[PDB]
Ligand binder design. Structure first.
Ligand SMILES: CC(=O)N[C@@H]1[C@@H](O[C@@H]2O[C@H](CO)[C@H](O)[C@H](O)[C@H]2O)[C@@H](O)[C@@H](CO)O[C@@H]1O
Ligand SMILES: [Ca+2]
Ligand SMILES: [Ca+2]
Ligand SMILES: [Ca+2]
Ligand SMILES: [Mn+2]
Length: 1106
């Protein structure tokens, strides 16, 4: 390429003025808000050196009519009249340029559109809107190839671990052309660096073209090439289908430049100095301050009406983690906080799940969690909904160009995507407001799932900023699913934080420039996941690694959760307590993974600092990618080694909420992924102190040991993959008030003792034991007389109807019971040997081997008693008992909660009399049934369906069957046809068909096809050696009927006491009647619904005999 030339600059017709602070002077054109040049400490950076007195309004070129006024020494103002009759533009905008110390601020302070526009109302011609304002062509700052050290550095979005989003371009003549959008951009000489911020929500496309709030352009002027950074175009008045968006969607255009000399004392001026200075002018995502202290993120899941994780139970998990981490901060995403759980009832944000304890228990959870530094978030959806939801309406649904529905997720029900632009234009904001009104204060984050994938249409930068602003206005922090989503406002990205998702192309933001700037403000980065290579092969700053134990994707591994916190997250979060100050790359390495051999340039040393001038230096141990030392670092704090390779001994000076600790509470954490002794130099304020070591378990600080300090050093030779904490004085573990608000002490057997129970019988026969998943449970075995454990149920309301259950897995034939005595009445329920395996994937005691009870299985099922308090609640007792037997019964999770069912002879309490289930007041699950093994351990596709006429009922969009038969609720199974397996069954603890007694079982049902589902009678444990079943295939209910059909069956209890009834998915093919895809799922061909179950003990007389 040959040396380039362009027009020189003739400014004979230009009048300049100057504005200046004490440190920065800007030469500005009086004709147009353009900075020609900046001066700071005798050094200069050009701005826009060639006049370009045009703007683009609604993508039309306009020569503005400008009047100028210098307001004060630092500030000038321009009134800019905009007229283009042919394109219906008639407007004016006021712009101010203002110097603030070493910053230049560009603000559009006022916009007047002379066309009549009313936010929220119809507009007959959208071209009358003033929708976009572009000052492209006027660089806010630049650098010339004639200047020494001229360079440009910019970041674009990349989520591919192999591909950096950053460009580093020497500004030379000649050079390659440049006309490209960027998220962050810096120009620098060897004397000055500048960074540019804009609130522009411009996009030039997806991927690396998105979030492009800046545009960099090469311009040749005389004999020099300039690279300038421009703000990308801004948005203003916008509409959807002629309906103008609300006023809050309009944000006045703003951009800033900051100019700096050396800012990290390395005696070089480059983009890193610009990036440090940039933190003073940049947007900061709301709630970012919290991020550095949220060390323990995880999901607590509810799903399908099951109430796997009641709000008050999550508080006990928080307490376990508080103990085990010695008071690290936590963030629990409640996936299923609403409606019947996860993926139920979307859009009705205020519909807080009733079966998990409703708004009352959610408020208690939020309030009580504060002292443990545990922040709650909720999973919501702004992209699709289901007929059941209050907000399902034809008007909100997304339709394809051909008129068909844009079908969304199908799982419990078939959802339809919504049109998010329509939604914004029609009151979306009020749904968030309703949630805030109901829930009140203290919720931390809203996690918006899906958004960013286009299901609901445009989910790009502008639309996401609007959505985030609605959420932030309620006081909530914004979080999203995708690595590329919400770059401007998000503080957490599930696909960045869960390293296992999506593979190497779908992870966090692969940009050193971006991470340098924002590492401390969000979990949005590339974490350590060696099999993805590139940036993910041992990032020096770590990167959040999220695991779970409360049911998300069937995750139950508590111990693995805690070890992962210490293996990845403690040091990740430690670094977020500082800001990056220096970043040094090494030489390129060659890697091979994921089907490619590629070059990657790794970071070798990163320095960070805090406001107290602490200095942290993180160094990769080798640049050799085939050496084990490539995946090792040293970390020093003010020169003192706190990590080397597999081990760290790290100070931690912040409480769970991030507040500075008192001197006597300052501590150090030790963790080593390998066996072996390590030696550490203590800091001066520890070196002459006594030092105590504690092993951290789910019981808190254990195995106190005073350490020997020699020559101001300690040596630690402790268990691998095990957290320890050190203090300078003896520490104890606090009272945890286990299960507060749940009416019983320690419902999950987490407190390491049974002393709060009154035990009747031989106490040696009752012990707390660990399941195969390390879940603590009460075990009773080997007892020759009854053993009982009793507590008072405390804090109950007088004259109130309640349910209580205990999870029970009984391996003995002996009677295992739950008994409530209210002071005025006693009720009891029992099980002999359990006969139904647990198939609820989000439930901690499902039958997956790694959270099995014992012998690789789990038969846990909730065993209920229903009772009513009298006038006095000072002596209500709960007793768990086990009659004589050799084998074990396991109990866990005692939940006592208000419930208004009337199942027993039309009365609430456990008692005699006809059994009826109208599904209108179910405590949880699908009682008296429990989900069967049709889908194995699954987020089971059977749940309680909720009525929303007409959408859930026959006739809407051709629906063949009602989701709900009578009242507001039925028992629905979605599409589980042709499976040859049991969908659900009664179990004797829920309903016992007594030996030799005969019952009439009646229910009403919908079935979308003939003989796809069958009513079945079984006994004992079902085996799919397949079990004998009495089989009654059921006809469809709509081809020859306008409503649900009634079915009636006689069932005699087997002498073994283990008879049950259920619904079975046959081997027959269903019939979708020529429909396919979403229509076929929606319309219910493959569905089964039950309601109005009745089971009545009868004596066979007269014609019953036939
Ligand atoms: C990975 C993730 O968050 N995916 C979302 C889906 O989540 C799935 O939800 C179903 C139940 O509906 C089940 O629990 C799966 O295990 C879980 O991965 C789902 O919420 C959809 C809804 O459109 O969004 C994501 O794909
Ligand atoms: Ca520097
Ligand atoms: Ca437990
Ligand atoms: Ca009903
Ligand atoms: Mn439903």
């Amino acid at each position: 390429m040959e040396k380039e030339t362009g027009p020189e600059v003739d400014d004979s017709k230009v009048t300049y003025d100057t504005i200046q602070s004490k440190v920065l002077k800007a030469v500005i054109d009086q004709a147009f808000p353009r900075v020609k040049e900046y001066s700071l400490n005798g050094h200069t950076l050009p701005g826009q050196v060639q006049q370009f007195n045009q703007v683009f309004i609604n993508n039309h070129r306009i020569t503005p009519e400008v009047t100028y006024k210098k307001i004060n020494e630092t500030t000038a103002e321009y009134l800019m009249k905009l007229r283009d009759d042919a394109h219906l533009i008639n407007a004016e905008m006021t712009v101010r340029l203002q110097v603030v110390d070493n910053q230049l601020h560009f603000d559009v302070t006022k916009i007047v559109n002379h066309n009549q526009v009313t936010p929220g109302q119809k507009i007959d011609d959208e071209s009358k809107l003033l929708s976009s304002i572009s000052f492209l062509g006027n660089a806010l700052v630049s650098v010339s190839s004639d200047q020494t050290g001229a360079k440009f550095d910019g970041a674009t979005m990349s989520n591919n671990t192999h591909v950096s989003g950053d460009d580093h371009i020497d500004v030379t003549n000649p050079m390659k052309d440049l006309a490209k959008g960027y998220m962050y951009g810096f120009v620098s000489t060897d004397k000055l660096a500048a960074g540019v911020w804009s609130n522009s929500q411009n996009s030039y496309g997806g991927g690396s073209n998105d979030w492009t709030r800046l545009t960099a352009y090469k311009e040749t002027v005389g004999n020099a090439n300039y690279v300038g950074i421009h703000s990308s175009e801004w948005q203003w008045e916008k509409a959807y289908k002629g309906i103008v968006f609300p006023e809050y969607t309009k944000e006045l255009p703003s951009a800033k430049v900051v100019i700096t000399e050396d800012a990290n004392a390395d005696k070089n001026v480059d983009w890193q100095d610009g990036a440090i200075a940039y933190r003073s002018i940049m947007n900061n995502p709301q709630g970012w301050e919290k991020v550095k202290d949220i060390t323990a993120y995880r999901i607590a899941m509810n799903f399908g009406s099951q109430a796997q994780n009641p709000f008050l139970m999550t508080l006990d998990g928080i307490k376990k983690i508080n103990l085990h981490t010695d008071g690290l901060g936590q963030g629990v995403l409640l996936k299923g906080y609403g409606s019947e759980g996860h993926d139920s009832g979307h859009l009705n944000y205020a519909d807080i799940g009733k079966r998990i304890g409703g708004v009352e228990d959610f408020k208690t959870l939020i309030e009580k969690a504060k002292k443990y530094g545990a922040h709650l978030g909720i999973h919501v959806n702004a992209s699709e909904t289901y007929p059941e939801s209050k907000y399902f309406n034809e008007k909100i649904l997304r339709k394809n160009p051909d008129g068909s529905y844009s079908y969304g997720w199908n799982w419990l029900d078939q959802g339809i995507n919504i049109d998010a632009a329509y939604d914004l234009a029609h009151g979306r904001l009020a749904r968030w407001e309703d949630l805030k009104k109901k829930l009140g204060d203290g919720l931390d984050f809203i996690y918006v799932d899906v958004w960013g994938n286009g299901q609901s249409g445009d989910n790009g930068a502008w639309a996401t900023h609007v959505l985030a602003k609605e959420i932030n206005k309620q006081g909530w922090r914004f979080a999203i699913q995708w690595g590329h989503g919400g770059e401007y406002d998000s503080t957490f990205h599930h696909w960045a934080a869960d390293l296992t998702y999506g593979g190497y192309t779908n992870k966090g933001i692969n940009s050193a420039i971006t991470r340098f700037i924002r590492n401390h403000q969000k979990d949005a980065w590339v974490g350590d996941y060696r099999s993805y290579g590139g940036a993910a092969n041992y990032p020096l700053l770590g990167g959040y690694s999220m695991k779970d134990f409360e049911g998300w994707q069937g995750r139950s591994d508590y111990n693995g959760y805690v070890t992962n916190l210490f293996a990845h997250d403690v040091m990740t979060k430690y670094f977020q307590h500082f800001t990056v100050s220096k970043w040094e790359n090494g030489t390129p390495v060659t890697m091979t993974d994921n089907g490619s051999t590629y070059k990657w340039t790794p970071e070798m040393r990163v320095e960070l600092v805090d406001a107290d001038n602490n200095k942290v230096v993180v160094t990769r141990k080798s640049n050799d990618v085939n050496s084990p030392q490539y995946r090792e670092r040293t970390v020093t704090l003010n020169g003192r080694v706190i990590q080397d390779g597999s081990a760290y001994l790290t100070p931690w000076n912040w409480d769970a909420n991030g507040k500075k600790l008192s001197t006597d509470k300052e501590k150090m954490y030790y963790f080593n992924t390998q066996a072996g002794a390590t030696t550490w130099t203590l800091p001066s304020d520890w070196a002459k102190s006594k030092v105590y070591l504690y092993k951290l378990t789910d019981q808190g600080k254990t195995e106190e040991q005073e350490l020997t300090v020699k020559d101001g050093k300690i040596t630690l030779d402790l268990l691998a993959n095990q957290p320890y904490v050190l203090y300078r004085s003896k520490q104890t573990n606090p009272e945890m008030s286990w299960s507060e608000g749940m009416h019983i002490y320690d419902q999950g057997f987490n407190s390491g003792t049974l002393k709060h129970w009154t035990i009747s019988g031989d106490a040696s026969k009752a012990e707390i034991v660990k399941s195969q998943g390390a879940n603590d449970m009460l075990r009773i075995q080997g007892n020759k007389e009854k053993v009982s454990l009793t507590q008072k149920l405390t804090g109950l309301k007088p004259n109130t109807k309640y349910a209580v259950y205990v999870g029970v897995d009984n391996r003995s034939n002996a009677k295992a019971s739950i008994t409530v005595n209210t002071g005025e009445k006693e009720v009891t329920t029992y099980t002999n040997k359990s006969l139904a395996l647990n198939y609820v994937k989000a439930y901690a005691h499902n039958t997956r081997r790694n959270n099995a009870t014992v012998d690789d299985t789990s038969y846990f099922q909730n065993m209920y008693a229903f009772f009513t308090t009298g006038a006095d609640v000072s002596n209500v007792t709960l007793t768990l008992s086990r009659e004589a037997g050799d084998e074990a019964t396991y109990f866990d999770e005692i939940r006592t909660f208000e419930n208004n069912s009337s199942m027993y002879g039309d009365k609430h309490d456990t008692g005699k009399g006809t059994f009826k289930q109208d599904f209108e007041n179910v405590a949880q699950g699908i009682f008296p049934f429990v989900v069967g093994g049709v889908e194995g351990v699954e987020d089971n596709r059977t749940h309680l369906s909720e009525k929303h006429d007409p959408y859930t009922q026959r006739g809407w969009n051709g629906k063949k069957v009602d989701d709900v038969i009578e009242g507001n609720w039925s028992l629905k199974t979605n599409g589980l046809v042709s499976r040859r397996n049991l969908v659900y069954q009664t179990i004797p603890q829920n309903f016992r068909f007594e030996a030799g007694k005969t019952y009439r079982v009646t229910f009403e049902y919908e079935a979308g096809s003939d003989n796809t589902y069958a009513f079945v009678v079984g006994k004992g444990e079902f085996q799919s050696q397949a079990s004998n079943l009495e089989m009654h295939e059921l006809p469809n209910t709509w081809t020859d009927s306008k409503k649900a059909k009634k079915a009636t069956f006689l069932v005699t209890g087997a002498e073994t006491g283990d008879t049950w009834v259920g619904i079975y998915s046959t081997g027959n093919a269903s019939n979708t009647r020529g429909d396919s895809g979403g229509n076929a799922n929606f319309r219910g061909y493959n569905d089964f619904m039950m309601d109005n179950l009745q089971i009545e003990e009868i004596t066979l007389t007269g014609k019953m005999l036939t």
